[PDB]
Amino acid sequence: GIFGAIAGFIENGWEGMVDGWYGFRHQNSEGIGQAADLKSTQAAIDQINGKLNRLIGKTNEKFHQIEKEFSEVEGRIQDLEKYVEDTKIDLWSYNAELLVALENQHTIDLTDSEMNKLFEKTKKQLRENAEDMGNGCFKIYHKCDNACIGSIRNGTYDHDVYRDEALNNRFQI
Amino acid sequence: GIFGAIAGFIENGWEGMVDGWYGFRHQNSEGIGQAADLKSTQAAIDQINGKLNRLIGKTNEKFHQIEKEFSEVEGRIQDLEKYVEDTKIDLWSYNAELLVALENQHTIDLTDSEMNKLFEKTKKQLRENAEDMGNGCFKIYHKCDNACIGSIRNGTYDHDVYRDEALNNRFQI
Amino acid sequence: GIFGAIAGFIENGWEGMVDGWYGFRHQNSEGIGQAADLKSTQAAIDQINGKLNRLIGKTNEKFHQIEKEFSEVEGRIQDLEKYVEDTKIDLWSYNAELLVALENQHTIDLTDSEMNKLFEKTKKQLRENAEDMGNGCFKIYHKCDNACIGSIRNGTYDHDVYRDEALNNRFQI
Amino acid sequence: PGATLCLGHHAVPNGTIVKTITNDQIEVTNATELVQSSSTGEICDSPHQILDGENCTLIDALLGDPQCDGFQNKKWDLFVERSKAYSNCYPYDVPDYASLRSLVASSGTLEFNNESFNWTGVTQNGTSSACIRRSNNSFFSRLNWLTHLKFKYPALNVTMPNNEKFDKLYIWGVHHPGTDNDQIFLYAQASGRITVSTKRSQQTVIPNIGSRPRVRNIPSRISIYWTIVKPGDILLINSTGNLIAPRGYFKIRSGKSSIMRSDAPIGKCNSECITPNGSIPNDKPFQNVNRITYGACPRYVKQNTLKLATGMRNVPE
Amino acid sequence: PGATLCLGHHAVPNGTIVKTITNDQIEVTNATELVQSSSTGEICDSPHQILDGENCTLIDALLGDPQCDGFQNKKWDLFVERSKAYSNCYPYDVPDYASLRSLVASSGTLEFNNESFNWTGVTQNGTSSACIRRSNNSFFSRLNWLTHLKFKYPALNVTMPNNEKFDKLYIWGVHHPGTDNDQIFLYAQASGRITVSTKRSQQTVIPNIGSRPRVRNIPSRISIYWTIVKPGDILLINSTGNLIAPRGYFKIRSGKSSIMRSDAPIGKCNSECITPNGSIPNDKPFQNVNRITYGACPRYVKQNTLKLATGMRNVPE
Amino acid sequence: PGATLCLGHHAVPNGTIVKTITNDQIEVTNATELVQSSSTGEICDSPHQILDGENCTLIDALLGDPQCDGFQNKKWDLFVERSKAYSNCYPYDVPDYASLRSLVASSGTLEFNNESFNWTGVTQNGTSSACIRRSNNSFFSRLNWLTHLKFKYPALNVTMPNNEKFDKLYIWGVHHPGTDNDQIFLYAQASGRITVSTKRSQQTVIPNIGSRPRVRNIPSRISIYWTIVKPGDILLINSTGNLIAPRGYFKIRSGKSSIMRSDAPIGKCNSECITPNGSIPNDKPFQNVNRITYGACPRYVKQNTLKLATGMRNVPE
């Protein structure tokens, strides 16, 4: 949320994108298409797997401890045994609550970040050949067939090839 | 601070904005005006109220515990009672300190974020009709009366209406 | 990482920049040069020193406590003394682990932020006289000698001086 | 000419300083306090059931010191013990005092049921000038001082079954006379042990004759013991002298009751959190009033203030 | 005409609600549970060495109650005590019971070594009808009930050196007869104290004659004591009657062993984490099954669910 | 032609690996260690007042073993007990030893004040060959072994008021002779109990005659007890034999004092944090040297290293 893309300027997610977490939809002379972006997808996944690696399968061994249930009333010593355990449980419960709240805030933010980073990268790549429509979409001011769209998605788009055409279309009356 | 708007490229706050947290000042042919932006204001407020809802009015009930003050010297058992309590208090004191430091860092950042998001939204909306002056202000290159400014604040500004006028003013010699 | 500059659109760091943490390299008619940016450098340093001030030289005094090693087998009381200490140590060990992980995530992010902020400031300053090449570099579309580059680094660059020249170079065929 | 449109944010003339991860002093537009640091100084009588001990400790109310007769059979959520409390009956001690005090405090009741013990062969209802009840010599209301009958004290072997569905708490004692004369005058024989038993427990105590420093002019002592008897078990008391006998049992319950030492006045008011300094509001998550608390209370911390930002960085004109 | 290129992200039709710092309910695309809240209900017999107490408490297996003979010299990682367990030998108590139970549990062995004590002048191997072993009157297997020989019980002053390289745990007892007749019948003299000593310790116990409520028709009692003897130290036993003597010593080890109260069945399965409700998986960091655990276990918390987001905010079409 | 202006950041050839929330290994330009893991191996004699016990335990210095005479009336912040320490006086034990050791350690003083006890009718200043002080038979300096005077030991009933404004700590003992002969030789009568009392407390102890395994050729024992007497209260000692009497009282203070077991040498140096391994620097927030600490110390953790990033991600050319 803090970057402003996911649940922000991107109006909604795409239920029909099932082969990645982030990607591109386009419309050009040859149709309307969708493609996943693998690098951004893997960047988010790697970070979340990093959190999982620090939480899952990491337990501590304990053996003989103190008693925690009692059949008889005893007074002072038992009051202390119970208080030590209640103290411990409340501290661990607090740690667990905070851990999940913080980690979840951070996951939502880092995933929003990866969306924003992909958007920014694409904006820069297009140079003077496109304009940002405000909703995560670019209007590209030149003929941009499937190979051209592919070149943008693959980082091989040469903006100089199309710049004269695009400037003429952008700055007409 | 981490987004760079509040205490960053926005030179200072506005003491005379009392009906919102974020907003717009303008100068045009009809004067100089100020208006609060309700959506950004409410977004920040909702997040802070979320933190408050998790901290205020949420106490734990405890009843019979251990003794924590002693009139007589006793040795081993009393040393343990005192150590358990001192241990507990130091852990909770640490939790409280960290909680406030982290939450405050985050509040400053999320409020900075909401300012940046409003700025970015406005920049995109204006398309080729304005330029960013670097200080949170846009120079708008067409006649933009009160209804026009209102249309920008309400998200109903049609950049195409003014684009020919604006491009002519921007790209003159 | 979360802002996308350091280890992102900036391909790598500069081992030959030893008088600051952030800065500028340029090429113009008079050569290729490097200069550190002191304000961004100090902003990052001040934040890290803030963390250090809250962790270094801040210990707690403790005096008489409980025994923590035992020469004889005793049963119930000793089981409780050992459990209290083991409990305490595990809680502090958890606090230490989390503290370092969170603080380090935040340091990497705040330093990335300071790089991004300097880049954004410079982009705005250049107005219509330059274009972002996508890799942290700007192509400046006018003659920009050493004093001119200096004016950009010092915040005294007047974009209006060069705008006619730059627009002519940018929007040619 | 055109127009200018500037984006901005508010500020205030009276900002507040908070701490963050990277700066110990940064001004924000507003903040709220997370540490409760004050009390009005009264313990509110609602919504917890408060029992003001006044001149009586809990143990004195248990045994039945004559200043504590108004406490009979009362219950509490919180028993409040005052620093002015003092004993004015036969001088006694309780081995493990802290544990008896704790278990009765936690049970939260002084509900007492008399039982008909068969004390054939001895004189019951011994009294003393060190325990005055309405100008008359008296004794602890819940204890039965047994002495010789016609210069005979036969061996007691007295039983009391628990055919109830709950546990019974028995309080009893051993009298330690100041001299050999006193031993003979009271019990008509040389001292010997007292054994109190059940199917699951046994306690034997030896009377020890001798002068202790006088307390309210008394050089003898009583030592207090207790025994819990489970359903279908049986109390057995075996004595040849020196027995301060039970008159019955206390009910023992479990629940939320406790005890607190405080000199704060009780007020007609409503507060969920009690400390020895008085009740405190419980809106805040933390407090630095007292580590001793009862009820729904903020957690005790060492800090006297912790300010949570509730607004943005304040950047004044 | 040109083209449009839109950047976006996935969503799912079945998102999950998580908590964050700023919102207690936000939908993400996926999450994982961090609190283990279920068990299958069996204690897995692997990989920890499990000893099912069946009808025997650990202390009954220690002393050698006749239903516990199959336990001799066995070891465990975890001794499991069942709520149905009951004693069927001479009625006894153990001052500090909890501590003896704890130290034997933690040692993790019932390894016992017989020693040749010099009991010249008394009758060994006393038995009772309250402790039947194969229809014959018997007694605790690890204890030696000494009585008069030809109406004489001479003063015992018996020594046993520890010339081993490890510590020895001795278990012994004092017999409290129900009557003066019984005292004379068994020991041929009036009762007197037992003193068990080493170079570093001394324990003296006084037999107390008297009826306790009958348990399996027995009004007498045995009280159990223990002594640890270090290398190069010496056990000395000094008695004139009422001694329930050791037959030897238990080895005392240190390690990872413990004891748990549970009625869960033991299963043929493999799980690292044991609770009284059964073994639980230990993939998750937290659990709300039981505060009592043994092995590599998640940490007990009060929450029954804590969902960790594993995907972005879910923003459906 | 124009110009190019590139924004960038530094890097180093020798980066350091740290842990984060999302990656257990990421290289940054610089880091600092937060866990102190070393000591020089000496306990610094400044700024805390250190008392090296040398051959003496605190309790031996208290009672006044002849090797501990140099300790009289000394104070400490930290008493250091050495593993080589041994006793060389009359063999003794202290029921609750750990508690007496703790309360004296915490008080931080051996300040002793002699008092004139009225021991009319007995011989004072008993000595033994098991406690040699300058080749002469001797005894604990702070204790007074009372024996018969002309084959008489009359009943002692001796009082000592506390008319001071502070509490007094009395240390005293009971002698357990090895035989009935020894009992008669020393006290001229059969053993009987010792009762030490105040207005608020009573302790009675029974001498138990018998051989214990010999320690430095002595089969008898002394058992050590203590009593605290408050202002306006009175110590009363009632004995007919076997009394190891106090010679006066120790002052009891409150403050920052403690005790530590260590074999580390004391050095001429200045360090605020003491562990049994030696003093450690206290710049870092955490340490993994020892859970046992005294003074302004980092907190003990299990980690041997925790690296805090102090620079950005390192992204080398």
Ligand SMILES: *[C@@H]1O[C@H](CO)[C@@H](O[C@@H]2O[C@H](CO)[C@@H](O[C@@H]3O[C@H](CO[C@H]4O[C@H](CO)[C@@H](O)[C@H](O)[C@@H]4O)[C@@H](O)[C@H](O[C@H]4O[C@H](CO)[C@@H](O)[C@H](O)[C@@H]4O)[C@@H]3O)[C@H](O)[C@H]2NC(C)=O)[C@H](O)[C@H]1NC(C)=O
């Ligand atoms: C700086 O930031 C803080 C925190 O965001 C703001 O403080 C909040 O201010 C609001 C508006 O005044 C408060 O809302 C009111 O709360 C009352 C409850 O008061 C007690 O109970 C809570 C917890 O149980 C305590 O935390 C609190 O300290 C009090 O002891 C309600 O009774 C109020 O009700 C009124 O309005 C409602 C509207 O529906 C009506 O129903 C009622 O008739 C009544 O008149 C109201 O809801 C809120 O409690 C404050 N929170 C805290 C934590 O203090 C500051 O306003 C802000 N300052 C500035 C200048 O912006």
Ligand SMILES: *[C@@H]1O[C@H](CO)[C@@H](O[C@@H]2O[C@H](CO)[C@@H](O[C@@H]3O[C@H](CO[C@H]4O[C@H](CO)[C@@H](O)[C@H](O)[C@@H]4O)[C@@H](O)[C@H](O[C@H]4O[C@H](CO)[C@@H](O)[C@H](O)[C@@H]4O)[C@@H]3O)[C@H](O)[C@H]2NC(C)=O)[C@H](O)[C@H]1NC(C)=O
């Ligand atoms: C929502 O988000 C979660 C968390 O990211 C995803 O859950 C993970 O899903 C993957 C893929 O199915 C799981 O990977 C598999 O793990 C198995 C281990 O299972 C147990 O052990 C772990 C810890 O020890 C427990 O946490 C877990 O609950 C199980 O009890 C492996 O056995 C699997 O191996 C299979 O694939 C490998 C490929 O090399 C082969 O070698 C094997 O032959 C075998 O067939 C596999 O590695 C992973 O465990 C899940 N993690 C958690 C924490 O649950 C969800 O997939 C995701 N949902 C959606 C819709 O995206």
Ligand SMILES: *[C@@H]1O[C@H](CO)[C@@H](O[C@@H]2O[C@H](CO)[C@@H](O[C@@H]3O[C@H](CO[C@H]4O[C@H](CO)[C@@H](O)[C@H](O)[C@@H]4O)[C@@H](O)[C@H](O[C@H]4O[C@H](CO)[C@@H](O)[C@H](O)[C@@H]4O)[C@@H]3O)[C@H](O)[C@H]2NC(C)=O)[C@H](O)[C@H]1NC(C)=O
């Ligand atoms: C990698 O990152 C770390 C942390 O930011 C840097 O370490 C700091 O380096 C500075 C500069 O050298 C150090 O500053 C010096 O501190 C001395 C105190 O030393 C001890 O005390 C502290 C705490 O009490 C301990 O943490 C520390 O380990 C030492 O045991 C001062 O005595 C120094 O004073 C000198 O300069 C001043 C200037 O006014 C003069 O007054 C004096 O005459 C004297 O010559 C100085 O202040 C700082 O202590 C370091 N901090 C830590 C935590 O280690 C690394 O420099 C950095 N590395 C790189 C390559 O950038």
Ligand SMILES: *[C@@H]1O[C@H](CO)[C@@H](O[C@@H]2O[C@H](CO)[C@@H](O)[C@H](O)[C@H]2NC(C)=O)[C@H](O)[C@H]1NC(C)=O
């Ligand atoms: C043992 O000594 C105490 C204290 O000297 C004696 O108690 C005092 O007795 C006198 C005379 O009866 C009283 O007036 C005092 O009030 C008592 N003092 C205290 C402190 O209690 C006690 O009588 C002596 N015991 C015996 C058996 O003679």
Ligand SMILES: *[C@@H]1O[C@H](CO)[C@@H](O[C@@H]2O[C@H](CO)[C@@H](O)[C@H](O)[C@H]2NC(C)=O)[C@H](O)[C@H]1NC(C)=O
């Ligand atoms: C609440 O009561 C406690 C009573 O102990 C106060 O804490 C004591 O404060 C005095 C100084 O005023 C110190 O000398 C003591 O060390 C404190 N006692 C303990 C046991 O820590 C406390 O100040 C009171 N708080 C309020 C808000 O009234």
Ligand SMILES: *[C@@H]1O[C@H](CO)[C@@H](O[C@@H]2O[C@H](CO)[C@@H](O)[C@H](O)[C@H]2NC(C)=O)[C@H](O)[C@H]1NC(C)=O
């Ligand atoms: C003391 O009283 C108890 C209880 O009344 C006596 O024990 C009972 O004795 C009868 C007759 O022998 C038995 O049938 C009962 O089973 C016993 N009851 C219990 C509860 O144990 C005991 O015998 C008496 N003691 C003496 C020495 O006479």
Ligand SMILES: *[C@@H]1O[C@H](CO)[C@@H](O[C@@H]2O[C@H](CO)[C@@H](O)[C@H](O)[C@H]2NC(C)=O)[C@H](O)[C@H]1NC(C)=O
């Ligand atoms: C595991 O066992 C414990 C057994 O105590 C269960 O906790 C008890 O649950 C009952 C209600 O079912 C409560 O009345 C008790 O207060 C609980 N006991 C204690 C001591 O807290 C627990 O529910 C079981 N958990 C599972 C998952 O089976």
Ligand SMILES: *[C@@H]1O[C@H](CO)[C@@H](O[C@@H]2O[C@H](CO)[C@@H](O)[C@H](O)[C@H]2NC(C)=O)[C@H](O)[C@H]1NC(C)=O
């Ligand atoms: C009880 O037995 C012990 C141990 O056998 C006797 O103590 C030994 O006595 C001999 C002869 O005097 C000494 O040389 C040994 O050093 C003693 N051994 C130990 C281990 O102390 C003791 O004398 C016997 N007691 C009685 C009263 O006869």
Ligand SMILES: *[C@@H]1O[C@H](CO)[C@@H](O[C@@H]2O[C@H](CO)[C@@H](O)[C@H](O)[C@H]2NC(C)=O)[C@H](O)[C@H]1NC(C)=O
């Ligand atoms: C400081 O002293 C302690 C002394 O106990 C050291 O910890 C022990 O280390 C040994 C191995 O060297 C282990 O076998 C023990 O289990 C440890 N003892 C305890 C009680 O945990 C410790 O290594 C020393 N540290 C330094 C830095 O010298």
Ligand SMILES: *[C@@H]1O[C@H](CO)[C@@H](O)[C@H](O)[C@H]1NC(C)=O
């Ligand atoms: C872009 O990359 C994909 C990778 O699968 C490839 O199939 C495609 O042909 C590429 N297109 C262009 C235009 O480079």
Ligand SMILES: *[C@@H]1O[C@H](CO)[C@@H](O)[C@H](O)[C@H]1NC(C)=O
């Ligand atoms: C913008 O919205 C406000 C809402 O109060 C309305 O009053 C105003 O007339 C609107 N102006 C335009 C130009 O849409």
Ligand SMILES: *[C@@H]1O[C@H](CO)[C@@H](O)[C@H](O)[C@H]1NC(C)=O
């Ligand atoms: C920029 O600032 C530096 C500060 O050292 C100065 O030396 C330099 O001359 C300045 N250049 C210009 C062009 O302003």
Ligand SMILES: *[C@@H]1O[C@H](CO)[C@@H](O)[C@H](O)[C@H]1NC(C)=O
């Ligand atoms: C500032 O002043 C206002 C009005 O007097 C007051 O309500 C508010 O709480 C004050 N804010 C701070 C942060 O002190």
Ligand SMILES: *[C@@H]1O[C@H](CO)[C@@H](O)[C@H](O)[C@H]1NC(C)=O
């Ligand atoms: C409590 O005791 C004092 C003095 O001993 C007396 O004046 C007062 O009346 C007593 N109060 C009650 C309630 O019994």
Ligand SMILES: *[C@@H]1O[C@H](CO)[C@@H](O)[C@H](O)[C@H]1NC(C)=O
């Ligand atoms: C003892 O006193 C009680 C309580 O007043 C009375 O009911 C009872 O009759 C008395 N019994 C004897 C035997 O004196």
Ligand SMILES: *[C@@H]1O[C@H](CO)[C@@H](O)[C@H](O)[C@H]1NC(C)=O
């Ligand atoms: C217990 O009572 C019985 C039966 O009257 C008697 O024989 C015995 O002496 C009593 N025991 C004690 C210790 O008083």
